[PDB]
């Protein structure tokens, strides 16, 4: 999990999703791409 | 994708081929690799038969111009048309041994005489001799 102020899609399998008021990036291809805004 | 000017042009050309030809054979060709197609193309060019895959919507427009309007219903599912423009048959023949041999796809209905031809009984065209048999 990368935690930062600026979260983005890093590849075409990244998805932005909001969970519980928090913006996140989930990726089905590359675990390193997974982020939480914070 | 295909602008409207494109598709109009695609229709026009398929229609013009339809006027010159004498025997149309329609078949499914889904699930066949391009090599076996490429092989069928050399067999079409050889045998003077014009081959096209075209959108079923777009074919319905070509057909209606005459006299293939029976074929409408053959345009449900993946469609491959075969226009034997020089000589009749040979395509009807060619497609079936090619159909049988490759156990993929099927073959739908042919059409000669402005009469739809039923999948099974196409054996009529697929046994009509050479022109060039009456001698």
């Amino acid at each position: 999990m990368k935690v930062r102020a600026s979260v983005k899609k890093l590849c075409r399998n990244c998805k932005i999703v909001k969970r519980d008021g928090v913006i996140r990036v989930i990726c089905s291809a590359e675990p390193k791409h997974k982020q939480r805004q914070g | 994708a295909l602008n409207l000017q494109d598709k109009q042009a695609i229709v026009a050309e398929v229609s013009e081929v339809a006027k010159g030809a004498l025997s149309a054979v329609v078949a499914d060709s889904r699930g066949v690799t391009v090599d076996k197609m490429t092989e069928l193309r050399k067999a079409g060019r050889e045998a003077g038969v014009y081959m096209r895959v075209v959108r079923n919507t777009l074919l319905r427009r070509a057909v209606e111009g005459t006299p293939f309007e029976c074929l409408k219903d053959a345009f449900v599912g993946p469609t491959l048309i075969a226009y034997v423009t020089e000589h009749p048959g040979a395509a009807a023949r060619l497609f079936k041994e090619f159909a049988k041999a490759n156990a993929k796809f099927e073959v739908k209905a042919a059409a000669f005489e402005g009469e739809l031809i039923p999948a099974s009984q196409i054996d009529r065209l697929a046994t009509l001799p050479t022109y060039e048999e009456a001698i």
Binding site: - | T38, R41, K42
Partner: protein
């Protein structure tokens, strides 16, 4: 199932052929001299592509094809090596005629409906390897 490009009346070598299809279950000597046996008719020093076809019992068949376009274009330009920088450095000339010959050989191997199309493909190769058509 493996594909090679082997020298006409030559076969067997280890870095060239041996290991390659040898590590698939193929009888080396058999293919060597069968290959040579049928490729005897080829001109000397024409590198010819062969598709080797092996079955579960290690037995095999093969098809011989016409030599590569790059090869015929190398020979037609009288050169040995294509450009290191094709279309930046030019390395020679084949006439439209030579193109056509190569095209008819490779026509035996093309997918072109006409002489012109095949020739255009061969031209495509000739361009790809910094040979000018002259």
């Amino acid at each position: 199932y493996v594909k090679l490009q082997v020298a006409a009346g030559m076969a067997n070598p280890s870095p060239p052929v041996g290991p390659a299809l040898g590590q698939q279950g193929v009888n080396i000597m058999e293919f060597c001299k069968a290959f040579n046996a049928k490729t005897d008719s080829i001109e000397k020093g024409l590198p010819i592509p062969v598709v080797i076809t092996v079955y579960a019992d290690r037995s095999f068949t093969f098809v011989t094809k016409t030599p590569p376009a790059a090869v015929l274009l190398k020979k037609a330009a009288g050169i040995k090596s294509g450009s290191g920088k094709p279309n930046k450095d030019k390395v020679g000339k084949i006439s439209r005629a030579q193109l056509q010959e190569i095209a008819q050989t490779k026509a035996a191997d093309m997918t072109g409906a006409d002489i012109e199309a095949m020739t255009r493909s061969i031209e495509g190769t000739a361009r790809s390897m910094g040979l000018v058509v002259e």
